[PDB]
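PROTEIN DATA CARD
Card holder: Transcriptional regulatory protein CssR
Chain length: 88
Origin: Bacillus subtilis
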Amino acid sequence: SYRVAEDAREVYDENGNIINLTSKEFDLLLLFIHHKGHPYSREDILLKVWGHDYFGTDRVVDDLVRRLRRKMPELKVETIYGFGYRMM
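Structure generated from the sequence above:
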């Protein structure tokens, strides 16, 4: 339902509306779309999006996912309760 330009870091919906993701939102999108079905824990996402020296709340991951899903409601992201997220 989306055209994802990984060079321009832009997303276009099926009608050609531009969807502007932040850099972390785009990184998260790439984790999902190239690994469909894979269960990502919150820590897994943190290490790949925030890096190796972040020790704060994992609720930043939940926030990032919600922002991505509000910007891209047709994405088949699913919450894995108590664990993390996957995209089908």
